[PDB]
């Protein structure tokens, strides 16, 4: 058990995983030049709450750009929630967005598309 | 299969026959028929077996089979959503750049565009050592065109001067919005003489221009100072003499080019 | 076997014996015993045909598994070359993000991006311990531009004086709009007596102006005040000392340079 | 007809064309159930009159058993051929499998009538 | 003493005259199953001829090939031969437990040998 | 038996000469559906590549690669790489604007793998 918290850059994003909340929230642009560096921690963290007991988990997430390497690890990260999910356990995941930029939210869709587990596009409002 | 019935059902029957029962043969028969039998049994458990461990590792190869498949969409799924990604980056880059460097109204370059366009120039002047020309456009009486017909009236007819111009220039020649009513012409590698011909084509192309505002179809001049740009100087003093050159075709009367020299 | 063998032996010694010839049952253990060798060769075969069946099915398989793996590998290096490629597009979005907080009236830098400068250039005066010159330019009696010739043509004399400042900066130097008629000049890693010569050439430029308002030409010039960094002082107090510099060079005529 | 599975092979027998076609991987569970009626269809139609007979096979894997049903067939084609029945037998593969094509040629050792093993892109 | 190495696509075998007891391990798709089974069949006949003292098969085989399968079956044959006849003779078949089918294979070689046939697994 | 695309603003101009035996593409390569166009592509390769044993050239000009475009080109390497490892003379030229700077060192990222002929070309 741990709380991760990883500051932001302007290249790469701030994350926050509060283990008694039960809550994994992630914020900004993500271009890591190492991306194992920056998100191995993170799944890790992910698969380390998901073995520890039944508590739920929930992702909260504000991203704005995703480099290739980072769709690919929110993918490794939805993929774990997705077995989690057909297992029993209640996981789920808001993705905040600005309205006026719509385009964002089709790219949400994208993620959530195999994704059976609660997914809410939100909009600020 | 056909044959190996025919064959025991044979043998039964012979088997069943009184008239053979206590010959030397018979128990023999007997014995050895059912010897074909065990060896039948063993060779049909051969195969059974053996085709349980076929069905076993063919589930696993279906298995590894569904994985690679698997990656394989996943490769193709974290493409597709990068590519969209950069496309909306692009979109967004796209509009940026026009914003800083295209002049809403006409649309041609803006001074920003031109500034950065005259600073490569005279560097590539100093290396190579060819030169550009400068051409600078006012529009004579604007002030008429606005006060009659409306500031409406007046935009169109810039609208079509920047039209007429850029369809008169050459490919790489630059046509940009230098002021209200100002224009700003860059004949990259060009010469004064080669430029001539080029520059009384645009001009010939402004005046023949006939914009209709309703019931009037408007006729516009331009003043129009040229220059060349003369090596060991900076853009600005090179725009500086275009500028003074439009200055000397303004006071002498209009609708005129004048070109500014260098005596020795 | 060996019952087996000892039957067969048997059997054969049997079918050996000439006065069982043409029986029936005679008959009937030949055929069994062909039969016998027959199957035995028949499995021979099915068993060499089968053993190759799954031999080419092992390679297929040991094939797959390799395949997968470089998958795995091309997936992770794909991505990384994409994320390289996304860098250029980004350090292409920053530059423009950058270029669009620009005075909408003359293009250059205002007065935000000038503090935004400012306080990196403070930064740079630790790190590196190089200061940097500022300066303060205003342009003289423009209210007489103005009230003469109008806000118009008051406004292309600052559009105009932009220009000649940005044509006469170094690489590294930056011009801003601080506000109204007075700019900022900031060049970094620089001491005043390798300014003093840029500062003179800004002021030409400036001075040769000749700005059109319908058929006449403008004549302008500036005064400008000049300092040093002086470090772990904040930016504010910088600007401050340049500013008072700029305030004597007016107290003591136009088209003035002090230095403080 | 009987429809293939993905561990079954398909298998149509064409009474007018008189032709056997038979495709796919063979791992049936049942394979007496799934391969004595091909070898009753077969032999009923060597009995019926003199049509010449023509197998025409792209199998992938075939399981002990169906190596030995595929035995089983083969032994009717030749003691047809021998009988002077028209009776041929054409076995397509992928190039990029050779594997297979030796196969096919272990099949064919002990056959007298036409075996063709023929490649394919 | 028979010893015979084993490779990526055979068994290795270790027939121990002074225990008295062959041990197989791995995999087998053997290229000539005759060259290498018959060996072991030779053995095993040499040892039951011998003299009366118990022969145990220790077998942690994984895959095998119908050739191997047979010659499998020809050596339990000859085990059962021994057994109906006095020789205490016997046979453990070690498998892991996460797969199944190995055990159901294992038992169906069981299943006409009358000699203690222990499947394990580990 | 030629392969021509031309290149609008978001995917590249692909000529494929059979007979010089040369796969050149200029420009960038933001395909909207990146099958459609790089399907043809890897069928004329492979087709030259199975049609006889003339080598085979690629000359590159291409400039802003995305994602799905970066994977069909190494597929296309791919292709290269095994007719290389048979004995097929196969060569590529990438050329690039010395003013990118970071363009070589994404060149030499699709190099690494590549046993044949891969030149990496600074061009003014
Ligand atoms: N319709 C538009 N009018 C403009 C625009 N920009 C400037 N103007 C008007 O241009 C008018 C041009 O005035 P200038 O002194 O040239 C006056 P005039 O045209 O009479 O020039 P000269 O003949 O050259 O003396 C001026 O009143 C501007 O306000 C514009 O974007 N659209
Ligand atoms: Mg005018």
Redesign the interface.
């Known amino acids: 058990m741990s709380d991760l918290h990883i500051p932001g850059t302007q290249?790469t994003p701030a994350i926050q995983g509060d283990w008694q909340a039960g809550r994994l929230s992630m914020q900004g642009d993500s271009?890591p030049?190492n991306?194992y560096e920056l998100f191995g921690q993170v799944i890790d963290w992910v698969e380390r709450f998901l073995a520890d007991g039944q508590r739920p988990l929930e992702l909260d997430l504000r991203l704005l750009?995703?480099?290739?390497?980072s769709?690919?690890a929110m993918?490794d990260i939805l993929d774990l929630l997705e077995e989690a999910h057909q297992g029993g356990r209640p996981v789920s995941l808001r993705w905040h967005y600005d309205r006026r930029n719509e385009?964002v939210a089709?790219?949400a869709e994208?993620?959530r598309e195999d994704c059976s587990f609660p997914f809410a596009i939100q909009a600020h409002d | 299969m056909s044959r190996e019935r025919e064959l025991d059902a044979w043998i039964d029957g012979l088997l069943a026959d009184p008239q053979f029962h206590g010959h030397p043969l018979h128990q023999a028969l007997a014995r050895l028929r059912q010897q074909s039998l065990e060896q039948l049994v063993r060779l049909e458990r051969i195969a059974r077996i053996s085709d349980g461990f076929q069905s076993m590792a063919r589930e696993q190869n279906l298995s590894l089979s569904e994985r690679y498949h698997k990656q394989l969409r996943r490769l193709e799924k974290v493409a597709r959503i990068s590519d969209r990604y950069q496309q909306m980056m692009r979109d967004l880059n796209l509009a940026l750049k026009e914003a800083s460097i295209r002049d809403p109204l006409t649309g041609l370059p803006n001074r920003r565009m031109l500034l950065e366009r005259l600073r490569e120039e005279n560097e590539r002047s100093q290396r190579h050592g060819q030169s550009y020309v400068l051409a600078m456009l006012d529009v004579d009486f604007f002030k008429q065109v606005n006060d009659t017909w409306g500031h409406d009236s007046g935009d169109r007819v810039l609208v079509e001067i920047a039209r007429a111009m850029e369809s008169e220039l050459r490919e790489y020649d630059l046509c940009g919005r230098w002021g209200g009513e100002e224009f700003l012409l860059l004949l990259p590698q060009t010469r004064l003489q080669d430029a001539g011909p080029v520059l009384e084509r645009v001009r010939d192309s402004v005046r023949t221009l006939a914009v209709r505002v309703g019931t009037e179809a408007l006729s516009v001049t331009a003043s129009v100072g040229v220059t060349e740009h003369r090596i060991g100087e900076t853009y600005s003093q090179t725009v500086n003499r275009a500028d003074a050159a439009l200055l000397d075709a303004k006071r002498s009367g209009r609708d005129k080019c004048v070109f500014a020299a260098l005596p020795p």
């Not at chain 1, 750009?65 to 390497?69: C, G, H, K, P, Q």
């Open positions: 290249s271009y030049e991306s750009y995703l480099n290739t390497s769709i690919k993918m385009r089709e790219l994208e993620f």
